[PDB]
Design a protein around this motif. Structure first.
Motif, short mmCIF file in Angstrom:
data_model
loop_
_atom_site.label_atom_id
_atom_site.label_comp_id
_atom_site.label_asym_id
_atom_site.label_seq_id
_atom_site.Cartn_x
_atom_site.Cartn_y
_atom_site.Cartn_z
N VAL A 72 34.59 47.75 48.86
CA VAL A 72 33.98 46.48 48.46
C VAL A 72 32.87 46.58 47.41
N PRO A 73 32.03 47.63 47.46
CA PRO A 73 30.97 47.76 46.46
C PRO A 73 31.48 47.86 45.01
N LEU A 74 32.65 48.46 44.82
CA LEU A 74 33.20 48.59 43.46
C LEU A 74 33.68 47.22 43.00
N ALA A 75 34.25 46.45 43.93
CA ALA A 75 34.74 45.12 43.59
C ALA A 75 33.58 44.19 43.26
N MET A 76 32.42 44.44 43.86
CA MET A 76 31.24 43.61 43.58
C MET A 76 30.58 43.93 42.25
N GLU A 77 30.97 45.02 41.60
CA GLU A 77 30.38 45.37 40.32
C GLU A 77 31.14 44.68 39.18
N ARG A 78 30.99 43.37 39.12
CA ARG A 78 31.69 42.58 38.14
C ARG A 78 30.98 42.50 36.81
N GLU A 79 31.76 42.54 35.73
CA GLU A 79 31.16 42.50 34.41
C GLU A 79 31.59 41.30 33.59
N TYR A 80 32.82 40.84 33.77
CA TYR A 80 33.30 39.75 32.95
C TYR A 80 34.07 38.67 33.67
N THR A 113 51.36 45.61 42.58
CA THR A 113 52.27 46.17 41.58
C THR A 113 52.41 47.68 41.80
N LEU A 114 51.34 48.43 41.58
CA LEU A 114 51.38 49.88 41.75
C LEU A 114 51.26 50.32 43.20
N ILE A 115 50.51 49.57 43.99
CA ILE A 115 50.30 49.91 45.38
C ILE A 115 50.40 48.68 46.26
N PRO A 116 50.84 48.89 47.50
CA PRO A 116 51.00 47.85 48.52
C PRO A 116 49.68 47.17 48.84
N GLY A 117 48.63 47.98 48.96
CA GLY A 117 47.34 47.43 49.30
C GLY A 117 46.22 47.98 48.46
N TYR A 118 45.24 48.59 49.10
CA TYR A 118 44.10 49.14 48.39
C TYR A 118 44.03 50.66 48.33
N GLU A 119 44.77 51.36 49.19
CA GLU A 119 44.74 52.82 49.17
C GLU A 119 45.57 53.33 48.00
N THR A 165 29.14 37.25 51.24
CA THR A 165 28.61 38.49 51.80
C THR A 165 29.68 39.56 51.81
N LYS A 166 29.27 40.83 51.92
CA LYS A 166 30.24 41.92 51.97
C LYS A 166 31.27 41.59 53.03
N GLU A 167 30.78 41.10 54.17
CA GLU A 167 31.65 40.75 55.28
C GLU A 167 32.69 39.70 54.89
N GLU A 168 32.23 38.65 54.21
CA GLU A 168 33.13 37.58 53.78
C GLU A 168 34.19 38.10 52.82
N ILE A 169 33.72 38.91 51.88
CA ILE A 169 34.59 39.51 50.88
C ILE A 169 35.67 40.35 51.56
N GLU A 170 35.29 41.13 52.57
CA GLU A 170 36.27 41.96 53.28
C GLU A 170 37.32 41.08 53.93
N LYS A 171 36.86 40.03 54.60
CA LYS A 171 37.78 39.11 55.26
C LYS A 171 38.69 38.41 54.26
N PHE A 172 38.10 37.92 53.17
CA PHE A 172 38.87 37.23 52.13
C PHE A 172 39.91 38.12 51.45
N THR A 173 39.49 39.32 51.06
CA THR A 173 40.37 40.22 50.32
C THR A 173 41.19 41.22 51.11
N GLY A 174 40.75 41.54 52.32
CA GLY A 174 41.46 42.50 53.13
C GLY A 174 41.17 43.89 52.62
N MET A 175 40.08 43.98 51.86
CA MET A 175 39.62 45.22 51.25
C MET A 175 38.94 46.19 52.18
N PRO A 176 39.29 47.48 52.07
CA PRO A 176 38.64 48.46 52.92
C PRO A 176 37.15 48.31 52.66
N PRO A 177 36.34 48.39 53.72
CA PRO A 177 34.88 48.26 53.60
C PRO A 177 34.22 49.14 52.54
N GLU A 178 34.57 50.42 52.51
CA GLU A 178 33.94 51.33 51.55
C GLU A 178 34.23 51.02 50.08
#
Ligand SMILES: [Mg+2]
Length: 234
Positions: A124-132, A12-18, A109-122
């Motif tokens: 991924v740690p914020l995406a893993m901090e899930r609360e709800y 919506t706001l951005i094409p990807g993650y940057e 794993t971080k690796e799997e998550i990167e592959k699945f989401t296409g998320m920049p490696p650095e």
């Protein structure tokens, strides 16, 4: 009068993650006098990164309206929890994991998550901090959604994957936050999204925009966030 706009982030706001592409959008919206509220499936940790990067210091809503974060002393963070804790969701996903071949944040794993989401490696740690909530990256057998629904959970398709969450949604959270602004004066509300997890928002604002082709009754479709701004100028 207060002009407020609820902005989804991914697709919506951005094409990807940057964040960079959104800088001009945020500056323009701010110049137009808007109160910009992020309302995304992203975690609070993820949104704090975008907020800092884009210098947005307004209230925000995370993980499909599971929580509303209001900066301490913002109204003349304070967290309003509306969803369910992620550990309760993971307890149930664990039971279903090997029945339906589920892959989500908690069992990838971080690796799997990167592959699945296409998320920049650095990032991924914020995406893993899930609360709800959790995200289902893949499955090998259909039927888990029906099972989660009957267990009291909500399953909503987002911009990329299904999200498993509690008893709330982007609209319930938006509605509650909108009441805080109403105590300050009249409000002209807008909402911009791109997928099913955004529909609940559309039902609570005056004007609605959908970036992309997904169609919705109360929504005007556009090809990009830039377009949204052009339209608004009038
Ligand atoms: Mg999105």
């Amino acid at each position: 009068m207060i002009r407020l706009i609820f902005l989804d982030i991914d697709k919506t706001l951005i094409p990807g993650y940057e964040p960079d592409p959104a800088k001009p959008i945020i500056e323009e919206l701010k110049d137009m006098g808007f109160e910009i509220i992020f309302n995304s499936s992203k975690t609070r940790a993820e949104q704090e990164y975008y907020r800092k990067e884009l210098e947005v210091e307004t209230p925000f809503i995370s993980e499909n309206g599971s929580a509303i974060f209001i900066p301490k002393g913002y109204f003349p963070y304070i967290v309003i929890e509306l969803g369910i804790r992620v550990e309760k969701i993971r307890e149930e996903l664990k039971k279903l994991e090997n029945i339906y071949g589920l892959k989500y944040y908690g069992n990838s794993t971080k690796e799997e998550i990167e592959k699945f989401t296409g998320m920049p490696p650095e990032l991924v740690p914020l995406a893993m901090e899930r609360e709800y909530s959790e995200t289902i990256f893949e499955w090998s057998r259909d039927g888990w959604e029906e099972v989660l629904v009957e267990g009291g959970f909500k399953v909503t398709m987002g911009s990329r994957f299904y999200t498993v969450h509690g008893n709330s949604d982007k609209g319930k959270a938006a509605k509650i936050l909108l009441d805080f602004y109403k105590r300050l004066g009249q409000i002209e509300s807008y909402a911009v999204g791109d997928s099913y997890n955004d529909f609940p928002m559309f039902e609570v604002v005056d004007k609605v925009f959908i970036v992309g082709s997904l169609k919705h009754k109360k929504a005007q479709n556009v090809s990009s966030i830039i377009d949204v701004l052009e339209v608004i100028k009038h």
